[PDB]
Design a protein around this nucleic acid. Structure first.
Lengths: 769, 1069
DNA sequence: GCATGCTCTACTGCTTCGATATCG
DNA sequence: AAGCAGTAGAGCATGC
């Protein structure tokens, strides 16, 4: 520890002592092997700098410092060793590369002299030291954690390294590509269930649920509950895929053999994460606290010994109890754990290098805005120190690291806002606060639900705190911000298929929506949009149950000068009721009539004569509730949706009636092909790629339905921006030949006028016959 | 001046002394209050001039006094019982600084020049830093009516002063103090000035360097941009140049974030959201150091506290801890506070916006980043220990070394990475030809060269001195080594060449765009200095192939892409013509394509500088077109340019016909160079003819229907211009009409073709027929309405220049244009562009149009007086500027809240009457009344301004625009007649006024106010002034002594151009 | 030529104990 | 009364 001295000169003295003969040797390989003895995990940020410095100091004892280019057009050896040393002392990544190249250079030069009787012993010695590194280190530094795991997997003897600390080291230093390649190299050259369980624990954290299908078979001794419980968390369904993990945990028979302990900790850890991805802050707390002790565990010295427990049970303990602190009731049982933990040193460094944001949120809870300032500036400096160290060409590590800066600076914004005094007596800064918070959301469909829960719970705690301190109609203006935050949270949690989270988010956002008019419409639209999105994967006869449960509320009052006044609220109710009737009528028309067995009022509700009216009324009500939308939307992408659902539903009904023969449904159907061509050609004009590929459907519906509706094509094709057909120009210069070349004629004229270079080559072959 | 020769706690008494003197001599009514106005002036030129052993105080030591004088005056006159002394000492500071800057005449290194004012620089830059410290505090109501004049003088003065490094700082200071208070919420007057000045400064700064780029960028980004959001695309490389130009000079790396936070919150959130993918990935050189730096000691080592707190906490540490607060730590900013601000704004930027700092999830480049630079690893280094000698491979070091050398933001590692990279490139170069062979003894490495070469350039022109001194001879020595005889057209020179080329055709790089031109210069010199010149027949480094590459560069619809063909020509015009035999075959086939690129540049951008470089590109060639084939205009076999018909020789004679044929183009800046080249292309034939003989000789061979097809072009042969249009149809017709208007106005400006020869009824052109319709649409989306107002108001000045050309030349006799343009319509447009120009479409914001307007108005109003018609002009102008209109405008309430209209409608009449006087017909429109020889409009104005000041209640106050009006209004009323005895009888006046003490004599104040127009009027009719001046030298001797002093010193002052007037004054007195 | 920085020496007040005057 | 212990003030050396 006297090598990171905060004073020069003296540090040169201590380095000068250490570099001397008989204190650190002066043979190269023995010096390299001896350098591992002075590791001492207080210093490891500097360890690679010091290792390459001591290893390159004795370069300057040689007869080879005379012109290493030998000619006239040159430079000397020290001119690229001395700045190489001087740049290795300044940056970690070039230091990592220098040490990891010199190490392999020496160990691949030693293989000439010395027999296996000693080189095997040297490699086993180095293997024990690398295990000691990985076991003792507490500040996982990325260009070191990924340095020993990269000089490992290049040599044949160091491969059998440590499959249970490699996992929890490279998982927490965010260098998972290296450990995945290390264990997949160990699995080469009875089954080895331990390394497969840890390699699957690596792949489970960077997504990659595709490659958890070739692991968990029944030919490496693993059970049949683990495969069927990974196939329900691959699709985001963490309410059964965790519900059968504990059902695998406390079972008693196991008549194939025993469920080995590696799979037991896999079941435990994956059950922890599948409890984490929801918002159950009681079961995660109990399952994380109470698997070591009994009858109100003390925690106080309990976790800090038996060092398996720190790298597995501490994060979910502190997170669950903190999030349960961040609303509700006190239970001061974390604060004493931190206060008793901080008297040490190897606990005072671990609790503040890695966490610091849970600590800031802890001390802001007891109005210590002074310690919280230190802890949050410490967290900012730690983010910058870490992000500048994980590598360039390693994406998604930096995205998973950069997704925390918004919660950090929302804390920092609250700290700088509560202590200024240009505030807390006028609410004209409060209005600016509520209007800058509602326009700073994270993105949907890319930022997972832990980050949304972070930001929303911190914001609700901050708003409650400033309502406490704002004693200078202010208790409506904050609740009408909390509603619009939680509603956007639900609309992002639906799009990522996380339905069990969004469902209780609806169940908690329904007691006070009934006290307004702007709220219930948004409420019922979000509900009956979730009920449509959930029915895509239920098989049959249960989706009818759920879409019948969401009928009796879509037709409530709602028009208290509201549906008549507003236009988008009039459009959305209509398109959603149209899709509801479409769901029912497409459900009970592929499997005909068994679905009224479990039915008391369900049969009469579908009746709202036994197998014809119960389909015809549903299709015509779908047509009505779809046709209201285009006329309410004509007066982009606000008209394109209402157009294209109408076009696709009428084309679907046409192709359903095409494979049969009828008269009455043809008499109803004779209005639909007029409705297809215009409502597609009014959305093909606007720059829509979800309708441009629907052009051969027009070009065939004209031929198959030619007795009417061709002037209806010409009047619309006469004004369409005539570069939206350069894809289909070889598809129109063949309809030029035969009948109905009108409504090809005008557009081919326009293209031959404006761009007489596109059509020249598809015209020769068509004029050839 | 004796403020830094004091001690503290006495300087409070010093400032109270100066405040007490200034309070006492100010509160006695204005006769003596006009020495306050010069004492601050005197002290300013004292302290803005300063650049037992004593010292020489520079300029910092007085800024505490100048804050004391007006900030805490209320905490300075607490004992001394407080109206407006802070107000007055701010107004006099504004007046004195725009009077010290009014007369400096500044037309060290700057930019290869020092031809300004010999030593006025040191008295200037002290003033600019001094106003940087005293100016930007307390921008209250004291500064609100002072932004117009302070902005306007500095625009007008720096427009002739480009490379000064410092005339934009005071504009940045006034715009910061103009968005401090509101004033920008569109009063609609200064806004158009700054909107128009944005583009001019944007195009001027592109050819500049470090201090002056910094000056313009801190000007530009400090524009308000909550309100100048229109064309937000226009200046984002004036933002991403600040960050990339950060990292070595922090005070604009600050203002990048201080801008980028205020753009984003108030610009509406759809016109900003495409503009983040390029702003943000520049902001990631600010996250590269994890505090592993340890330079100077990080403890309290030993100080005056580290001993005094050792022996208990007694009173001496109270003495020391009341002593460390007043250090005024204001040294720019520390780098680590910038890194914390980068992280805090990156957090506050949003969630969706935030994830923009990297690649975009499997684009083209993401899956190319994962690949090795070259597959087989060369550069095997063998580090010698005592007994091992292992092998460490290079090339795994290169994508971190060369990334770390450019953008380090810590100089102690930057110089290390630079020294390493230079030795590594040297080892790479020496490795490339060993001795073994040429496939495994000299293995190729151009997949390393193709990424090592676009980084040597960005190092060798970066910012810093040391890396520039280290990489100049490397980047100049490997060009010498590559371009050789033994090289024999390899693949690395092609990589170097394309690196140079895309160094030129690149965005956000106006320091490298010139260095690649210097490389092209070295290419052309050393590529013929030692080559085998009988073998340059197939290689693609060839000057033939380089010129063809330059021509393909030269005709291209990408704006920055033709700039390479401009700049390479600009950098080797000194070559390729001081060696012969390669000019004549293609580069004058390239003059036409350079003019064609100049034709292409008609729609690009005000703020790029394409025009200003293409003109020099074709003017460097018209100084060697006139020294070579004067003696060598022969019928050779010559290569043929774009558009020209085939022949066997193109000697000089088809170019001039094409120049005649395309004088009707609507390309505004190619037509000018076409005509201007044709006039000096008409000589230098064997025979040495003249443009009068030549054009008449061709017309006698071709007829007037040939020389109206070129002039009318496509312009001979409309209600959508009812409201003001903006389409590319209307603008192209207006452009065609201006082409037809100005193509032959130069021909009748010269004496080449008479106006009766080509406008008589032999051509059947639609010219006057179209101009008569043109004069019937002239006074009847706000985005591009201005795009058409500009061309609607650049045509009327060409019409007036056209008639001023015709009616004064040798075609006298107006019998061709009776009612076509010279009707009652040109005498409508002339009247409305003379008076009231802001109701036909003339914007009030420009300078080089509103300084050309009264010139052409007077040049035409002198060209209708001697005409065979004047009745129409006089009986049209006699309907607006009658004397009764002056009388009804001369109201009774010109003080208070009538701030714009009632004191702006008078000033237009005043300037209109001045330009009538300058034409020479003030009296024909306005004769006097009947009897006396004194004009009874001038006597009316003089009595009005005389009675305007005397209250009758407390005080009729002042302004700047309550005196420019009253000093134009009074300079008018001496231009009518003699009117001098009325002046001296108004001066020598015994009438008594009073103010709320009495102390007023009404001649002293009226003299004291204006005092320079009065003396310049007295000096003209000198001999009939001194007699009645000196006659009353007994009863009013005080005032005539004052007037004689005030005339003697002013006559002494202009001794530089009127030396023989003061002699007459002396011999007469 | 005026303001400050640093030491050492004699003045001065506090604390504890014992004797003296006072008030019941 | 007795001991001591802490600070105020004056004079040499320095700086602007």
């Amino acid at each position: 520890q006297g090598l990171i001295d905060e004073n020069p000169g003296l540090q040169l003295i201590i380095r000068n002592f250490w570099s001397h003969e008989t204190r650190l040797p002066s043979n190269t390989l023995d010096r390299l092997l001896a350098l591992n003895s002075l590791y001492s995990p207080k210093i490891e940020v500097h360890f690679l700098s010091l290792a390459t410095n001591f290893l390159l100091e004795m370069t300057s004892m040689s007869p080879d410092y005379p012109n290493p280019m030998f000619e006239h057009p040159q430079i000397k050896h020290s001119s690229l060793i001395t700045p190489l040393q001087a740049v290795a002392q300044r940056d970690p990544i070039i230091a990592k590369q220098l040490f990891s190249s010199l190490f392999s250079g020496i160990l691949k030069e030693m293989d000439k002299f010395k027999t296996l009787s000693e080189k095997n012993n040297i490699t086993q010695k180095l293997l024990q030291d690398f295990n000691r590194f990985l076991n003792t280190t507490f500040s996982f530094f990325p260009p070191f954690v990924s340095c020993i795991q990269d000089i490992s997997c290049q040599h044949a003897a160091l491969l059998s390294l440590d499959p249970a600390a490699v996992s929890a080291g490279c998982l927490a230093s965010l260098q998972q590509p290296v450990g995945i390649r290390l264990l997949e190299e160990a699995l080469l050259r009875p089954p080895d269930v331990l390394r497969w369980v840890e390699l699957a624990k690596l792949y489970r954290s960077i997504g990659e649920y595709d490659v958890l299908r070739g692991i968990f078979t029944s030919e490496i001794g693993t059970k049949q509950i683990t495969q069927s419980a990974l196939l329900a968390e691959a699709r985001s369904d963490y309410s059964e895929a965790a519900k059968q993990y504990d059902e695998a945990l406390n079972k008693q028979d196991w008549v194939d053999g025993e469920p080995t302990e590696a799979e037991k900790d896999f079941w435990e850890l994956a059950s922890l994460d599948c409890y984490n991805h929801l918002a159950e802050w009681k079961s995660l707390e109990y399952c994380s606290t109470a698997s070591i002790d009994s009858e109100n565990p003390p925690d106080l010295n309990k976790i800090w010994s038996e060092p398996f427990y720190q790298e597995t049970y501490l994060p979910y303990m502190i997170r669950s109890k903190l999030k349960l602190l961040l609303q509700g009731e006190a239970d001061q049982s974390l604060l004493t754990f931190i206060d008793k933990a901080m008297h040490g040193e190897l606990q005072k460094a671990i609790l503040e290098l890695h966490y610091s944001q849970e600590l800031s949120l802890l001390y802001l809870l007891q109005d210590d805005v002074d310690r919280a300032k230190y802890y949050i500036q410490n967290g900012i400096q730690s983010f910058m120190q870490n992000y500048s160290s994980i590598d360039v060409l390693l994406h998604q590590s930096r995205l998973t690291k950069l997704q925390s800066v918004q919660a950090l600076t929302e804390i920092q914004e609250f700290i700088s806002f509560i202590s200024k005094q240009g505030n807390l007596s006028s609410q004209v800064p409060l209005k600016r606060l509520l209007n800058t918070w509602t326009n700073r959301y994270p993105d949907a469909k890319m930022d997972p639900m832990n980050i949304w829960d972070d930001i929303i719970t911190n914001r609700c705690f901050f708003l409650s705190k400033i309502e406490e301190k704002l004693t200078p109609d202010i208790s409506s203006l904050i609740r009408s911000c909390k509603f619009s935050m939680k509603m956007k949270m639900i609309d992002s949690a639906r799009k990522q298929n996380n339905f069990s989270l969004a469902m209780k988010l609806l169940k908690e956002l329904h007691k006070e929506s009934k006290t307004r008019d702007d709220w219930l419409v948004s409420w019922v639209q979000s509900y009956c949009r979730l009920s449509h999105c959930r029915s895509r994967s239920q098989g049959c006869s249960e989706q009818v149950l759920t879409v019948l449960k969401t009928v009796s509320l879509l037709d409530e009052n709602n028009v208290s000068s509201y549906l008549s006044k507003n236009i988008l609220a009039f459009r959305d109710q209509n398109i959603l009721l149209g899709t509801t009737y479409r769901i029912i009528a497409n459900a009970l028309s592929s499997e005909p009539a068994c679905l009224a067995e479990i039915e008391e009022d369900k049969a009469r509700r579908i009746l709202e004569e036994d197998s014809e009216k119960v389909i015809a009324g549903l299709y015509q009500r779908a047509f009505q509730h779809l046709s209201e939308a285009v006329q309410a939307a004509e007066e982009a992408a606000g008209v394109i949706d209402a157009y294209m659902t109408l076009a696709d539903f009428c084309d679907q009904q046409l192709r359903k009636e095409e494979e049969n023969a009828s008269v009455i449904d043809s008499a109803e159907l004779q209005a639909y092909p007029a409705l297809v061509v215009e409502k597609m050609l009014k959305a093909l004009k606007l720059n829509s790629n979800e309708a441009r590929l629907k052009f051969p459907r027009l070009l065939q519906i004209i031929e198959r339905y030619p007795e009417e509706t061709l002037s209806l094509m010409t009047k619309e094709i006469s004004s369409v921006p005539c570069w939206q057909f350069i894809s289909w120009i070889s598809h129109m210069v063949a309809l030029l030949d035969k009948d109905q070349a009108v409504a090809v004629q005008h557009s081919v004229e326009e293209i031959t006028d404006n761009y007489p270079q596109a059509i020249v080559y598809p015209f020769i072959i068509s004029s050839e016959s | 001046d004796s403020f830094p020769q004091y001690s503290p706690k006495m300087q409070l008494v010093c400032c109270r002394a100066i405040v007490k003197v200034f309070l006492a001599l100010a509160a006695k009514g204005p006769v003596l209050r006009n020495c306050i106005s010069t004492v601050v002036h005197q002290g300013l030129i004292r302290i803005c001039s300063k650049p037992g052993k004593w010292k020489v105080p520079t300029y910092k030591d007085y800024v505490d006094l100048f804050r004391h004088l007006l900030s805490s005056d209320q905490m300075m006159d607490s004992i001394l019982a407080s109206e407006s002394l802070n107000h007055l000492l701010y107004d006099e500071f504004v007046k004195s600084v725009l009077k010290i800057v009014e007369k400096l005449d500044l037309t060290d290194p700057a930019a290869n020049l020092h031809p300004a004012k010999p030593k006025d620089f040191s008295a200037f830059i002290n003033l600019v830093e001094f106003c940087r410290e005293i100016l930007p505090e307390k921008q209250a109501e004291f500064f609100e009516p002072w932004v117009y004049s302070f902005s306007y003088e500095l625009i007008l003065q720096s427009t002739r002063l480009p490379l000064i490094s410092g005339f934009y700082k005071l504009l940045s200071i006034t715009v910061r103090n103009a968005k401090k208070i509101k004033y920008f919420e569109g009063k609609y007057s200064c806004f158009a000035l700054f909107v128009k000045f944005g583009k001019e400064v944007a195009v001027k700064m592109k050819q500049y360097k470090d201090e002056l780029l910094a000056s313009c960028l801190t000007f530009l980004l400090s524009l308000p941009h909550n309100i100048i959001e229109l064309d937000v695309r226009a200046y984002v490389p004036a933002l991403q140049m600040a960050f990339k130009l950060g990292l070595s000079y922090t005070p604009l790396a600050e203002v990048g974030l201080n801008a980028l936070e205020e753009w984003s919150i108030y610009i509406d959130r759809h016109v900003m959201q495409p503009y983040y993918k390029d702003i943000l990935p520049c902001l990631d050189g600010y996250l590269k150091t994890s505090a592993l730096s340890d330079e100077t000691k990080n403890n309290w080592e030993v100080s005056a506290l580290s001993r005094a707190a050792q022996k208990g906490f007694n009173k001496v540490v109270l003495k020391h801890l009341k002593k460390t607060k007043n250090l005024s730590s204001n040294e720019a900013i520390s780098l680590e506070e910038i890194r914390i601000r980068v992280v805090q704004m990156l957090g506050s930027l949003g969630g969706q916006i935030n994830k923009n700092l990297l690649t975009v999830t499997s684009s083209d480049e993401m899956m190319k980043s994962y690949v090795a630079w070259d597959r087989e690893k060369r550069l095997s280094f063998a580090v010698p220990f005592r007994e091992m000698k292992p092998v460490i491979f290079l090339d795994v070091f290169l994508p971190r070394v060369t990334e770390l050398a450019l953008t380090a933001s810590d100089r102690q590692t930057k110089v290390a990475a630079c020294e390493l990279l230079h030795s590594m490139v040297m080892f790479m170069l020496g490795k490339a030809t060993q001795m073994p062979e040429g496939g495994q003894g000299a293995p190729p490495m151009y997949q390393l060269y193709k990424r090592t070469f676009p980084v040597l350039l960005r190092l060798a022109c970066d910012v810093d001195q040391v890396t520039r001194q280290l990489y100049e001879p490397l980047v100049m020595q490997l060009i010498h080594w590559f371009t050789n005889n033994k090289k024999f057209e390899s693949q690395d020179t092609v990589a170097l060449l394309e690196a140079i080329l895309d160094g030129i055709v690149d965005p956000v790089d106006s320091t490298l765009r010139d260095f690649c031109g210097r490389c092209i210069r070295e290419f052309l010199k050393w590529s013929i200095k030692q080559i085998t010149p009988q073998q340059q027949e197939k290689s693609p480094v060839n000057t033939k192939s380089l010129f063809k590459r330059l021509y393909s560069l030269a005709l291209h619809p990408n704006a920055f892409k033709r700039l390479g063909a401009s700049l390479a020509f600009n950098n080797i015009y000194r070559e390729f013509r001081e060696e012969e035999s390669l000019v004549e075959q293609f580069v004058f086939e390239a003059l036409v394509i350079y003019m064609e690129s100049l034709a292409l540049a008609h729609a690009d951008e005000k703020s790029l500088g394409t025009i200003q470089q293409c003109c020099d590109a074709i003017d460097h060639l018209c100084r060697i077109i006139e020294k070579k084939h004067v003696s060598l205009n022969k019928a050779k076999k010559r290569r043929l340019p774009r558009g020209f018909p085939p022949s066997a020789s193109l000697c000089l004679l088809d170019l001039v016909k094409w120049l005649l044929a395309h004088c009707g183009r609507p390309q505004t800046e190619c037509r000018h160079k076409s005509i201007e080249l044709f006039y000096k292309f008409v000589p230098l034939l064997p025979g040495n003819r003249s443009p009068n003989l030549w054009l008449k000789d061709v017309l006698k061979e071709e007829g007037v229907s040939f020389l109206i097809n070129t002039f009318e072009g496509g312009g001979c042969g409309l209600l959508y211009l009812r409201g003001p249009f903006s389409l590319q149809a209307t603008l192209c017709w207006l452009d065609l009409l201006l082409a037809a208007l100005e193509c032959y106005n130069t021909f009748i400006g010269e004496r080449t073709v008479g106006a009766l020869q080509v406008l008589g009824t032999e051509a059947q052109s639609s010219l006057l027929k179209a101009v008569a319709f043109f004069l019937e649409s002239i006074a009847m989306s706000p985005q591009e309405g201005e795009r058409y107002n500009y061309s609607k108001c650049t045509v009327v000045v060409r019409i007036m220049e056209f008639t001023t050309t015709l009616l004064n030349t040798s075609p006298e006799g107006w019998k061709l244009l009776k009612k076509d343009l010279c009707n009652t319509h040109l005498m409508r447009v002339l009247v409305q562009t003379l008076c009231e120009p802001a109701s036909i479409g003339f914007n009030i914001g420009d300078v080089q149009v509103m300084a050309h307007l009264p010139d052409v108005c007077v040049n035409l109003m002198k060209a209708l007086k001697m005409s065979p018609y004047k009745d129409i002009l006089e009986t049209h102008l006699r309907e607006k500027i009658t004397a009764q209109s002056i009388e009804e405008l001369c109201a009774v309430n010109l003080y208070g809240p009538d701030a714009q209209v009632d004191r702006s409608r008078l000033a237009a009449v005043v300037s209109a009457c001045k330009q009538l006087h300058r034409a020479g017909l003030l009296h024909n429109i306005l004769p006097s009344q009947s009897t006396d020889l004194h004009h009874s409009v001038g006597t009316e104005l003089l009595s009005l301004v005389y009675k305007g000041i005397a209250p009758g209640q407390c005080l009729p106050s002042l302004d700047l625009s309550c005196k420019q009006l009253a000093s134009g209004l009074l300079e008018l009323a001496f231009a009518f007649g003699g009117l001098c005895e009325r002046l001296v009888s108004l001066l020598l006046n015994p009438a008594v006024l009073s103010t709320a003490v009495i102390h007023f004599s009404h001649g002293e104040y009226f003299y004291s106010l204006f005092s320079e127009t009065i003396n310049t009027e007295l000096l003209k009719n000198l001999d009939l002034a001194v007699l009645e001046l000196m006659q009353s030298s007994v009863d009013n001797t005080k005032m005539v002594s004052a007037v004689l002093n005030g005339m003697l010193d002013q006559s002494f002052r202009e001794r530089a151009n009127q030396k023989h007037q003061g002699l007459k004054l002396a011999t007469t007195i």
